Design a protein around this ligand. Structure first.
Ligand SMILES: CCCCCCCCCCCCCCCCCC(=O)OC[C@H](COP(=O)([O-])OCC(O)COP(=O)([O-])OC[C@@H](COC(=O)CCCCCCCCCCCCCCCCC)OC(=O)CCCCCCCCCCCCCCCCC)OC(=O)CCCCCCCCCCCCCCCCC
Ligand SMILES: CCCCCCCCCCCCCCCCCC(=O)OC[C@H](COP(=O)([O-])OCC[N+](C)(C)C)OC(=O)CCCCCCCCCCCCCCCCC
Ligand SMILES: CCCCCCCCCCCCCCCCCC(=O)OC[C@H](COP(=O)([O-])OCC[N+](C)(C)C)OC(=O)CCCCCCCCCCCCCCCCC
Ligand SMILES: CCCCCCCCCCCCCCCCCC(=O)OC[C@H](COP(=O)(O)OCCN)OC(=O)CCCCCCCCCCCCCCCCC
Ligand SMILES: CCCCCCCCCCCCCCCCCC(=O)OC[C@H](COP(=O)(O)OCCN)OC(=O)CCCCCCCCCCCCCCCCC
Ligand SMILES: CCCCCCCCCCCCO[C@@H]1O[C@H](CO)[C@@H](O[C@H]2O[C@H](CO)[C@@H](O)[C@H](O)[C@H]2O)[C@H](O)[C@H]1O
Ligand SMILES: CCCCCCCCCCCCO[C@@H]1O[C@H](CO)[C@@H](O[C@H]2O[C@H](CO)[C@@H](O)[C@H](O)[C@H]2O)[C@H](O)[C@H]1O
Ligand SMILES: CCCCCCCCCCCCO[C@@H]1O[C@H](CO)[C@@H](O[C@H]2O[C@H](CO)[C@@H](O)[C@H](O)[C@H]2O)[C@H](O)[C@H]1O
Lengths: 607, 56, 62, 178, 459, 170, 99
């Protein structure tokens, strides 16, 4: 427990050293992007040792490194939950981040602030590992809010662009609406259990946990971009592509699923929460699959792919399969990061062109990027024995063979075939068809800083699922008995989705003009959810702030009724008593009244 | 040392002298409040061999 | 068919009947408006390009 | 961006702007170049059939109906060039477009690293200072009597004169600054 | 306390007997050394609070407020130097003497053991405060700001004086320790309900309570920077500190007497935070942000729980450093373009990259990013209010959302977007200005490291 | 070290091991390399430090407070007696807080130690946490920010009078 | 109009002294004001004040209280007494009203 504990603590130390060097004058005498990639690379290697010792003996740890402050009968300690979820997420996140950071060197080579960009990515990774290794909610909330701030800074990287700054604040707003639920859970657990520590929270198993579990679900809804709090994730594509590869596809967006995985012992005894997660996930997995079918930005298609896969993770959580939902986080991290890397490879070579309508023929002119793009798409769609198969197929089996809401079941399968359809949309319009880009062709995909990171994630997208699946301890008992049509449902609907999309795409070449039916406009304009909610809601709330709060009350009626009426009264009393004629005759008359009044009071009060 | 130098740097004794004088007045405040020295329930004890007071 | 304007989704200029009006009363207003804009632009630019300016440009409208 | 707009658009200007929009949104629908070329020619034929309409009142009505037709057949998500308003790279480099007057605050140790650049910069500053008074006088001289004014600026008429109000145009930051 | 107060009094002759070229270097340096000496009050190895004499004490509530007061004096001096550099030598010395006077008065105020002594020092602070606002404020509205500030305070303070005399006539003393031990239950008469309000209103106006807060936005927009620093950081905390001291004798009427003030604060904190979304004046925005934060302090003191008092103490200190930082950051742009309109200067990250970093941390502190003491105070206040009534979280939740919105709104508007490049008078940041920001932000981080020092009396 | 009675830990029960495969276990070899490269030099540095400590051995003592009269034995208005009694009560209240912290620490350590068996093997720690929490609530719940010995006593007498009334009706 | 000065013009502080630190127009006064702030503010107060606070022992008797708690938990358990009782005050010391 000394080698294990040392390894967990050494990973954080290695990731801080790039941050520490940034504060010194040494940063300008070294290749900082290369130094930071090596620090992460070594940190991944160190993280493999605790991964191996867990695969062997399956022992779990609670590690406390620092006592922060005692509030009477509540001790706050920096402590770490080093269990199955934390050990495996650390190894996966460090591996992916190692690819993203090497890729950023090639991708952001022309940015004059590459060093700051590299530093921000490192900080995001530190906050994400604080989030996934925390043993108590307060430490978790540090990582929860940390990644929010780092995503804000990275989304709004090109800060002279108005649209980037709008997308950055949008992510803050939606995740702040989710943070209300996180705080609700925190206050509830400190009052009902006197702890934010997960071990003490486990003795809440028998209680009614509806109020706190509704809080975690709201926090997850915002953080994983589920329906209701969903629009910020596609808008976060404002940031540089390495930001989207790391944060908004592989690591940051699964924090919500991860939170609900941690609290799975409490959600298991609450059918209302399980039902809500199932239906919320199913609505998100369908809604964002519909949106992706008619998108033209390559980064927006992949963004909506992420929201749809997160919805499928939420459906898995709703079926009481926390370990399957976690295993999809790890497998999803590989082929999705590769997809973003390969699109960033294409975007860079075509002079910052992101529209698929000006791509085409990438299968021949960029052979390496195209091959990895197809590998990633086949893993996403559940091609057998690739990384996606070893989690997605079990998810489709579990939903078919369990007591479940029937609309949730149906739209989850419809959204799975729709996954094949929008994957085909990228393959058809980007890799096949004829060139549609400007005639001056200066494509170069030969840098090792581009090819090696993608190649490392292509291997993960082929073998990682198999290796993880056979090493993790047994968890939930799977149902391996079912009719042939339930066992092969995932493969059949995926293949069917390809044929439908492959057919519909060929019809785009016939010389017949396309029209705008009301169903496609819904898909293209994202169900109009942004075009309504992002206009009415800020308008009503911002109008009330000015017209009512500031103007009607603070500038008008709070002035009129307190300071201004006091001023008027005493001015009025001042002018009525000081407007004297200076005539001694009038004063002496008034003194006569004074004398008479004093004599009258004396007389009546005479006993 | 020099009237031009001293006329400029003599002011550097004011605040230090306020501190030393402030400390002196605080010890005089201790002397007026010795009515329960070594007489409280919590702390009273027998005096050590060569001890005149438990605190000063 | 037809587009129905709303306060948060306004009428396009191309669909606005007042954009296709060519009456000399309107064209005189449009020319008068540009004369105001052009004079204001000239005053701003003379301050902006003046090589002896040492401070920012005061903005009476703000 | 370089030329200021006029008080109003002539009927010809409005028609040619609809023509450019109509083709561009057609291109977004068609995607494929052969399909777009086919429908681009069909689109031009529709603008040609009414090219020689001399009624005006009918021509204006034909413009109305086309614009109404455009709004209904508009692509919801039209293609936008990456650097154009609404494009993905629009204003991407504004955070790098540092104005030239920032160099007036550089420290002498900072300026000593570019001795040649800051010698040329002095010549450009001397040129600017000498030309200003003439530039102001020319604009005052060339004001029209009737109040009708536009944003167009005159050239330098004489010799050795620079065009009025040139410094903010000539010395502006590069599109790709760094 | 005499070893802290006497050196502070010696700053006055030091100011007046220094040479014109040495005054700022002298008074700032010894002001730092006096801050060092105030740390002796933190040497607390038991649970008996320090009673130095019949007149001065210090416990875990006054000790942080005394040290924060001592720290602000050097910071205010550095903040004032640039905008005073055109005043003649005597006017500069007069200004420094006003700043020292507040430091002396406030340290004595927080260490007073007797309530009428607290009242006299509490009222004395108005004199140097008014002088600073009206003699060195920039606009014609500084005179109206002086009137509101002076008379919002005074009208509430007169009832406080009556209540203090009344308590003393009945008990025979206004010593705080004896009032604590000998307190007996009050009867719930109309007369005692008026007694409760007389004891509370002056502290509530000073916070300020929503409804009687109009003096504070006026006072900040018109004051000079050192006036804004002391007002936001320390002077508002006199009300919260007063409420905590005096509420010990008001039981059990606070159980029902507090309802209108919890309601005003919990609803009012939403009204004032929402104002910050549509405020065109940066100083006014920061000022309304304070009213929203101090509404939380009011609510948690009103419910009188161990958590609520501890969360209020942390927030008092955290807000003190954070708001003072924001005023200093805003004043650095104002000293360059001489406008407080937020939307005027833009894209400033382009030209002031390190000052923009100070802006970001101040903003992150303000929206209560964990594990800052800003978040810790607000979190424990939220927990105590939820216990008081689970529906309080609805209003807490709305305020948290709005606070993030305006905090990031201020950063995006002023630091990002395109640079307003007609502003060729954007001189590089002064060493003094960057040092001033660090002196705010290092203590905030150090206090986040060791939050036991600002937990207050109940934990 | 620490008191095994205050902070009890069950004895460890680690299996053999009994490896079947012929492959070498990488953790076994990495641990041997770790015990040489890392553990061994660190121990020498610590042993040097401990040798220096023994040459400068100093001692410190845990302070003992003699009991003083309780608030029950103080005449009302007797500030000198109330002060000492109140200060005693604050010392005890603080020590009660740390007793709660010890019991919660045992509970958390046991839950982690028991893992999937925690719902059965934590019964004694969960019951002690339940008992010690009941006793804590009776002493201190609802006293408020101005908690004190006088308020604690008033809270106790109010509870005693209700217990007596219920018993008398029985 | 009345007799009043014109408003003074904007000044660049770095034009005359490009090493201006923000404190004074006199360069030597400027650098020494800068040094005093950095020395007394940071080298003295922030470093030594932080050190002094860090080594305040047993702050508010938190270390003694945990040490005392372990002693009592140890004692109360070997002897079989309850860890903590409901009644702070021994009921024998209390005389309730007869009613
Ligand atoms: C001590 C002396 C300080 C030395 C400062 C220095 O020389 O750095 C030079 C370095 C480079 O110089 P520069 O490029 O010319 O500066 C121009 C701009 O400032 C450009 O600066 P920048 O924007 O590139 O970097 C500044 C950075 C601010 O500084 C940082 O580097 C980020 C530090 C984040 C927190 C620590 C790691 C996590 O700003 C941020 O990114 C804010 C991110 C907030 C992350 C939120 C996470 C909080 C939770 C974690 C804490 C709790 C731990 C829980 C454990 C369980 O500048 C700075 O880093 C900022 C200097 C300002 C003082 C920094 C104080 C940080 C104290 C830690
Ligand atoms: C963002 C928070 C909304 C702004 C606060 C506010 O002014 O609402 C006051 C209002 C007060 O009630 P109100 O909605 O009747 O205020 C008047 C509004 N007009 C002028 C449009 C009729 O409270 C709310 O209902 C906000 C929810
Ligand atoms: C910031 C944190 C800074 C950390 C700095 C750590 C420095 C640690 C210093 C200890 C170095 C001890 C080296 C050592 O083992 O030999 C010391 C040596 C001792 O040699 P030795 O440690 O090899 O002794 C071997 C063990 N015995 C003695 C039992 C056989 O110290 C001496 O110089 C001799 C005096 C004894
Ligand atoms: C009994 C008294 C015991 C305490 C005595 C403390 C020491 C006091 C003397 C410190 C000042 C030394 C002389 C001085 O005036 O400093 C000179 C410095 C620069 O002044 P200048 O006119 O520009 O001359 C240029 C020289 N190269 O000007 C300065 O900037 C000096 C700044 C002085 C700041 C106050 C010093 C406080 C010292 C700690 C107090 C210890 C108690
Ligand atoms: C984050 C990176 C860490 C940077 C700080 C590291 C310095 C350090 O060593 O601090 C550690 C120490 C923690 O000690 P402790 O509180 O006992 O921890 C809990 C139990 N282990 O923490 C400390 O003891 C230092 C506490 C800071 C002391 C402040 C120093 C003077 C402050 C100047 C006044 C300004 C503040 C005004 C308000 C203060 C209110 C009291
Ligand atoms: C219950 C606790 C709270 C009670 C607090 C009561 C506060 C009372 C403050 C009285 C303010 C006196 O304020 C005095 O009168 C008004 C206030 O409107 C100001 O008057 C100002 O506004 C008026 C319009 O309303 C202008 O015409 C006038 O030119 C301008 O000065 C005066 O300049 C100021 O001198
Ligand atoms: C129990 C007492 C509690 C209240 C405390 C006293 C507060 C002061 C209130 C009375 C004085 C304020 O008086 C209020 O403000 C100013 C005078 O200053 C007057 O306002 C006037 O100011 C000046 C001077 O005459 C004029 O140029 C201005 O145009 C006019 O509005 C207001 O019309 C009056 O209503
Ligand atoms: C805020 C800034 C604070 C600055 C801090 C500076 C503190 C300096 C630390 C000095 C510590 C050493 O202090 C010294 O230690 C010795 C250990 O030999 C102890 O000395 C005591 O115990 C030793 C044990 O051997 C005996 O031999 C000795 O006769 C006796 O006096 C005392 O404690 C002190 O005499």
């Amino acid at each position: 427990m000394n080698i294990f504990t040392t390894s967990i603590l050494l990973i954080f130390i290695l990731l801080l050293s790039p941050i520490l060097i940034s504060m010194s004058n040494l940063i300008k005498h070294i290749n900082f992007p290369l130094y930071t990639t090596t620090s992460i690379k070594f940190s991944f290697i160190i993280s493999l040792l605790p991964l191996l010792m867990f695969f062997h003996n399956n022992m779990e740890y609670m590690i406390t490194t620092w006592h922060w402050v005692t509030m009477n009968s509540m001790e706050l300690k920096m402590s770490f939950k080093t269990d199955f979820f934390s050990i495996l997420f650390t190894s996966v996140a460090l591996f992916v981040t190692w690819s993203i950071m090497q890729f950023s060197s090639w991708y952001m080579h022309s940015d004059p602030n590459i060093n700051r960009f590299i530093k921000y990515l490192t900080l995001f990774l530190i906050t994400m590992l604080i989030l996934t290794s925390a043993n108590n909610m307060f430490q978790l909330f540090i990582g929860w809010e940390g990644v929010g701030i780092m995503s804000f800074l990275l989304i709004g990287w090109w800060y002279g662009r108005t649209d980037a700054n709008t997308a950055a604040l949008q992510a803050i707003l939606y995740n702040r609406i989710g943070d209300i639920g996180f705080i609700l859970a925190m206050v509830w657990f400190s009052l009902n259990m006197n702890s934010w520590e997960l071990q003490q929270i486990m003795f809440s198993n028998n209680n009614d946990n509806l109020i706190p579990l509704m809080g975690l679900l709201i926090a997850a809804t915002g953080k994983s971009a589920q329906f209701g709090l969903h629009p910020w994730l596609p808008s976060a594509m404002e940031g540089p592509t390495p930001v989207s590869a790391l944060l908004h596809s592989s690591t940051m967006v699964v924090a919500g699923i991860f939170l609900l995985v941690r609290f799975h012992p409490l959600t298991t005894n609450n059918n209302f929460i399980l039902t809500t997660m199932l239906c919320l996930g199913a609505l998100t997995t369908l809604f964002t699959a519909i949106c992706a079918l008619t998108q033209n930005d390559i980064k927006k298609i992949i963004a909506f792919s992420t929201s749809s896969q997160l919805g499928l993770m939420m459906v898995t959580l709703g079926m009481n399969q926390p370990h399957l939902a976690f295993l999809h986080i790890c497998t999803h991290a590989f082929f999705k990061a590769m997809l973003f890397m390969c699109s960033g490879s294409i975007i860079h070579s075509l002079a910052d062109e992101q529209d698929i309508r000006k791509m085409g023929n990438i299968t021949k002119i960029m052979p390496f990027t195209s091959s990895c793009l197809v590998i990633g798409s086949l893993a996403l769609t559940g091609m057998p024995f690739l990384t996606g198969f070893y989690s997605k197929d079990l998810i489709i089996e579990a939903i078919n063979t369990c007591n479940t809401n029937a609309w949730a079941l149906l739209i989850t399968l419809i959204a799975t075939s729709m996954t094949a359809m929008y994957s085909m949309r990228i393959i058809y319009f980007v890799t096949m068809t004829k060139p549609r880009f400007p005639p001056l062709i200066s494509i170069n995909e030969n840098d090792p800083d581009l090819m090696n990171p993608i190649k490392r994630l292509a291997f993960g997208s082929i073998f990682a699922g198999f290796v993880i699946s056979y090493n993790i301890p047994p968890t939930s008992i799977p149902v391996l008995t079912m009719p042939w049509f339930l066992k092969t449902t995932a493969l059949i609907i995926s293949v069917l989705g390809f044929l439908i999309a492959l057919e519909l795409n060929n019809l785009t070449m016939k010389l017949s003009m396309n029209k705008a039916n009301p169903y496609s406009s819904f898909s293209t304009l994202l169900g109009f959810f942004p075009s309504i909610i992002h206009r009415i809601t800020p308008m009503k709330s911002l109008n009330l702030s000015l017209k009512t709060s500031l103007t009607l009350l603070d500038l008008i009626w709070l002035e009129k009724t307190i300071p201004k009426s006091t001023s008027t009264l005493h001015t009025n009393m001042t002018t009525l008593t000081t407007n004297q004629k200076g005539l001694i005759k009038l004063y002496f008359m008034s003194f006569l009244i004074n004398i008479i009044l004093i004599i009258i009071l004396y007389s009546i009060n005479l006993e | 040392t020099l009237f031009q130098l001293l006329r400029e740097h003599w002011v550097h004794i004011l605040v230090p002298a306020g501190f030393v004088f402030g400390c002196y007045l605080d010890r005089k405040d201790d002397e007026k409040l010795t009515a329960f020295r070594n007489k409280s329930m919590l702390f009273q004890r027998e005096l050590r061999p060569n001890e005149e007071v438990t605190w000063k | 068919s037809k587009y129905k304007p709303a306060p948060l989704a306004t009428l396009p200029s191309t669909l606005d009947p007042a954009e296709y009006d060519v009456s000399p009363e309107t064209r005189r207003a449009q020319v008068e408006r540009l004369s105001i804009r052009a004079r204001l632009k000239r005053e701003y630019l003379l301050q902006y390009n003046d090589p002896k300016r040492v401070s920012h440009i005061e903005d009476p409208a703000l | 961006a370089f030329c200021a707009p006029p008080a109003y658009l002539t009927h010809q200007q409005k028609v040619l702007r609809l023509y450019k929009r109509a083709l561009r949104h057609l291109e977004s629908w068609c995607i494929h170049r052969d399909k777009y070329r086919y429908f681009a020619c069909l689109m031009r034929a529709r603008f040609e059939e009414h090219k020689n309409e001399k009624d005006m009142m009918r021509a204006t009505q034909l413009l109305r109906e086309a614009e109404e037709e455009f709004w209904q057949n508009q692509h919801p998500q039209p293609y936008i060039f990456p650097d154009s308003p609404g494009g993905t790279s629009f204003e991407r480099y504004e955070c790098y477009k540092v104005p030239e007057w920032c160099l007036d605050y550089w420290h002498p140790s900072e300026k000593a690293m570019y001795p040649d650049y800051f010698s040329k910069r002095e010549q450009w500053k001397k040129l600017r200072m000498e030309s200003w008074d003439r530039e102001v006088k020319q604009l005052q001289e060339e004001t029209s009597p009737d109040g009708i004014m536009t944003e167009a600026l005159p050239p330098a008429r004489r010799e050795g004169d620079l065009p009025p109000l040139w410094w903010h145009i000539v010395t502006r930051p590069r599109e790709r600054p760094t | 306390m005499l070893k802290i107060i006497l050196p502070s009094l010696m700053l006055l002759p030091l100011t007046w007997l220094s040479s014109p070229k040495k005054t700022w270097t002298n008074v700032t340096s010894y002001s730092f050394l006096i801050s060092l000496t105030s740390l002796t009050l933190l040497w607390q190895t038991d649970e008996n609070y320090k009673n130095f004499s019949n007149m001065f004490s210090s416990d875990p509530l006054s000790t942080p407020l005394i040290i924060l007061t001592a720290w602000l004096l050097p910071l205010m001096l550095m903040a004032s130097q640039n905008h005073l550099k055109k005043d003649n030598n005597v006017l500069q010395k007069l200004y420094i003497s006003m700043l020292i006077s507040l430091q002396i008065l406030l340290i004595m105020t927080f260490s007073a053991t007797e309530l009428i002594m607290f009242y006299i020092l509490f009222e004395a602070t108005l004199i140097p405060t008014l002088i600073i606002i009206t003699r060195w404020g920039n606009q014609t509205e500084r005179l109206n700001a002086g009137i509101y500030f002076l008379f919002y305070t005074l009208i509430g303070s007169i009832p406080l004086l009556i209540a203090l005399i009344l308590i003393q006539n009945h008990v025979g003393t206004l010593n705080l320790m004896i009032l604590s031990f000998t307190t007996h239950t009050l009867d719930a008469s109309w007369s005692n309900n008026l007694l409760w309000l007389a004891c509370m209103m002056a502290f509530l106006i000073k916070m300020p309570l929503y409804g009687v807060h109009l003096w504070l936005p006026k006072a900040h927009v018109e004051a000079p920077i050192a006036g804004s620093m002391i007002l936001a950081a320390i002077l508002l905390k006199l009300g919260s500190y007063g409420m905590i001291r005096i509420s010990i004798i008001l039981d059990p009427l606070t159980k029902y007497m507090a309802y209108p003030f919890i309601l005003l604060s919990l609803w009012g904190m939403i009204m004032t935070s929402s104002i910050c979304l549509r405020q065109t004046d940066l100083k006014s925005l920061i000022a309304y942000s304070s009213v929203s934060h101090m509404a939380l302090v009011i609510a948690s003191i009103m419910i009188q729980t161990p958590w609520s008092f501890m969360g209020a103490t942390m927030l008092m200190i955290a807000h003190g450093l954070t708001s003072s930082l924001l005023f200093c950051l805003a004043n650095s742009n104002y000293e360059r373009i001489h406008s407080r309109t937020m939307i005027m200067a833009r894209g400033l990250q382009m030209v002031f990259p390190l000052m923009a970093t100070w802006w970001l941390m101040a903003s992150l502190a303000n929206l209560a990013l964990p594990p800052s003491i800003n978040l810790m105070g607000e979190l424990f206040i939220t927990m105590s209010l939820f216990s008081w009534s689970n529906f309080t979280i609805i209003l807490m939740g709305i305020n948290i959302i709005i606070t993030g919105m305006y905090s990031m709104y201020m950063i995006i508007t002023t630091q990002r977007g395109k640079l307003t490049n007609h502003m060729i008078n954007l001189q590089p940041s002064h060493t003094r200005e960057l040092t001033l920001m660090a002196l705010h932000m290092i203590p905030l981080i150090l206090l986040t490291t060791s939050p036991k020092l600002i937990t207050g009396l109940t934990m | 070290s620490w008191d095994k009675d205050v902070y009890p830990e069950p004895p460890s029960r680690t299996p053999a091991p009994s490896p079947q495969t012929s492959l070498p276990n990488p953790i076994t070899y990495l641990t041997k390399a770790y015990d040489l490269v890392v553990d061994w030099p660190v121990t020498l540095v610590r042993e040097f430090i401990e040798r220096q400590h023994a040459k400068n051995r100093t001692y410190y003592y845990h302070r003992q407070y003699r009991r003083v009269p309780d608030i029950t034995e103080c005449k009302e208005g007797d500030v000198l007696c109330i002060y000492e009694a109140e200060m005693q009560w604050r010392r005890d209240f603080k020590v009660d807080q740390e007793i709660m912290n010890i019991i919660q620490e045992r509970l958390k350590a046991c839950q982690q130690r028991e893992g999937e068996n925690y719902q059965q093997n934590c019964a004694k720690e969960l019951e002690q946490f339940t008992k010690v929490t009941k006793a804590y609530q009776d002493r201190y719940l609802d006293l408020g920010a101005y908690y004190s010995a006088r308020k604690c006593l008033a809270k106790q007498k109010q509870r005693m009078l209700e217990e007596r009334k219920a018993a008398r009706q029985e | 109009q009345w007799q009043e000065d014109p408003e003074p013009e904007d000044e660049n502080v770095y034009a005359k002294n490009p090493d201006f630190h923000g404190y004074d127009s006199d360069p030597v006064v400027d650098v020494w004001n800068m040094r005093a702030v950095f020395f007394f503010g940071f080298s003295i107060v922030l470093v030594f004040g932080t050190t002094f606070v860090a080594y305040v022992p047993d702050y508010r008797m938190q270390e003694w209280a945990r040490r005392e708690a372990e002693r009592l938990v140890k004692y109360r358990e070997v002897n079989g007494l309850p860890i903590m009782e409901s009644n702070y005050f021994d009921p024998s010391k209390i005389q309730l009203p007869e009613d």
